[PDB]
Design a binder for this molecule. Sequence first.
Ligand code: UXZ
Lengths: 241, 202
Amino acid sequence: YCQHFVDTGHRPQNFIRDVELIRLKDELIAKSNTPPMYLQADIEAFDIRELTPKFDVILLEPPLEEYYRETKCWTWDDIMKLEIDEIAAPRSFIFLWCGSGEGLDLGRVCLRKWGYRRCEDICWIKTNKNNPTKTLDPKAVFQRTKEHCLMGIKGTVDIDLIITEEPEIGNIEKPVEIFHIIEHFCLGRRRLHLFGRDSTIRPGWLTVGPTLTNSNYNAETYASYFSAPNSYLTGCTEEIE
Amino acid sequence: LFPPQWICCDIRYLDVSILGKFAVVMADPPWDIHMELPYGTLTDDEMRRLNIPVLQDDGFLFLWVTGRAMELGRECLNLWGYERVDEIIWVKTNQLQRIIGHWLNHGKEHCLVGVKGNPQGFNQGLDCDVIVAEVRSTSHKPDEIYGMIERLSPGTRKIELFGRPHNVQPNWITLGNQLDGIHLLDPDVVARFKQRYPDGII
Ligand SMILES: CNc1cc(N2CCC3(CC2)CN(c2ccc(CN4CCC(C)(C)CC4)cc2)CC(=O)N3)ncn1
């Protein structure tokens, strides 16, 4: 299929097909989810400490310069300085979007800097079914057709692939499938998405980002969702009655 | 000498300086990843110590990884003097083109790509960083990786470390401890081998 792509412009992933019922789990996540909360914040300029309590999951989607190789970017220099360890629960999880270049190394440095081990490498493979080429990074050896989302754990069902079609040039949205994978893990209910946008806001999630146009965040209102007897729920069990 | 060539040996103890310089190196090491052992592994220090740096002046290294070797493999890649510039992932399917650590089921295998020096005259950007292919045999790598490498650097000298019999390819020299003897055809190589090993034993 690699010879075929050299022949026709169809990436090998174009030809994957298919891309019992854990529908009960999907409903128990839904009932357990906190109301969506969101806050606009210049995360560069923002003390990540006012974000309390400590988070069970962190989804970290900083805007890389490479996402605009066709149309404020964050360098890995800037990301590596975010005090992520200060707001992570002692046992918690990070998913970090790393792009496909230096990020795959620098992102591993970040995970180690903030105290996580890499357990999963979730790979977003982009088909080009609707437009069978790409201008390459100077160091590139091959055409880049995927992005990596690194999963880290600190402390004591699904596949590691997402297959969608490549988004329209200068559309930076990441597949919503990432959220399903995270939710299906049942890692806890204090969930933070840093650098979310209006379009990513979502039940069971606290979104913080420079481009949000409205905020509803209140730390005391947020903390009330996890006060006893709800402090330790996986996000996958029944509500305590 | 274009046809297949191989050397049965222990890559730990072979003096690879006799082999010359290659445009591409490939390795699929038996990393001591998680516990147990279906084959014979190498310790992290033994992997660090492998004399990869002598095999190339300018060119590309391809390095299969898995589990914690994704970090370890990056360390060897950096220590041996490469910059990692791509990463190929093989998506494992069946004959019907459907997809086949402990948190997530593993639908893929990673191969790191490194560069040393300043390679020139390579057809960069021909293939893309994804491979889709049926899982022929367990613990085998997809034959497509050879096609991608030939298109990138056609006609050049290539060397595979920790290969097995099925891996022998034209333009390649395969090293592994399961190969049948020493089959060498390139004159310059045969010379340096006979010089270093007059009695034929590593
Ligand atoms: C002690 N020193 C040695 C040792 C040695 N060999 C010869 C060849 C060798 C290992 C020992 C390959 N091996 C093996 C198995 C699995 C993996 C993991 N890989 C599987 C393929 C992939 C999924 C694409 C990517 C992940 C890697 C290697 C099994 C085997 O039987 N032999 N040769 C010389 N000196």
